[PDB]
Amino acid sequence: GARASVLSGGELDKWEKIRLRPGGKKQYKLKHIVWASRELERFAVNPGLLETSEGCRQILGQLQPSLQTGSEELRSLYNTIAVLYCVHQRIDVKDTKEALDKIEEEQNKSKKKAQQAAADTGNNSQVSQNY
Ligand SMILES: CCCC(=O)OC[C@H](COP(=O)(O)O[C@@H]1[C@H](O)[C@H](O)[C@@H](OP(=O)(O)O)[C@H](OP(=O)(O)O)[C@H]1O)OC(=O)CCC
Numbered sequence: 001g002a003r004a005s006v007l008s009g010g011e012l013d014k015w016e017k018i019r020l021r022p023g024g025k026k027q028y029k030l031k032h033i034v035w036a037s038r039e040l041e042r043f044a045v046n047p048g049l050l051e052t053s054e055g056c057r058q059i060l061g062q063l064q065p066s067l068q069t070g071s072e073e074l075r076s077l078y079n080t081i082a083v084l085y086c087v088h089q090r091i092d093v094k095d096t097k098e099a100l101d102k103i104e105e106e107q108n109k110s111k112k113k114a115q116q117a118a119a120d121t122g123n124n125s126q127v128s129q130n131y
């Protein structure tokens, strides 16, 4: 149809399903979509970007390099913006982590060139046992 609000009827469905964390018991809710909308405007970023598959991608670009020295305020954003972004990119995740990895994989070439100082340690890989 047309473009309005952040998450439409369909998106709202999957959104409520997605969880803030993989090992948590607090699913996603409108409270998180609005909580970020009010926090975005504070960072000179209009909340209108949250309802755009493009904006969500840009917002993450500024938080990506900020994650290094970002507080709970930053992490929270990257969390919501993540699950939301995936939704707008025709992606269906289960938690905030799954939605995060999907992005890190698309910008894996950029990440490598954005952590020279943080490129002197091991990086163990996580496997999936259950479903
Ligand atoms: C009056 C407040 C207004 C309000 O309702 O604001 C909506 C929320 C903040 O409120 P909250 O939902 O209570 O806070 C969250 C819970 O304690 C959760 O258990 C914890 O997870 P874990 O990582 O510890 O499992 C979250 O991370 P930490 O930052 O604690 O790590 C924490 O933010 O905005 C957000 O930041 C959500 C962004 C996705």
Ligand SMILES: *C(=O)CCCCCCCCCCCCC
Binding pocket: 001, 002, 003, 009, 010
């Ligand atoms: C226009 O906005 C895009 C159309 C999205 C495809 C529709 C599939 C979702 C099912 C719609 C019915 C929802 C009834 C609550």
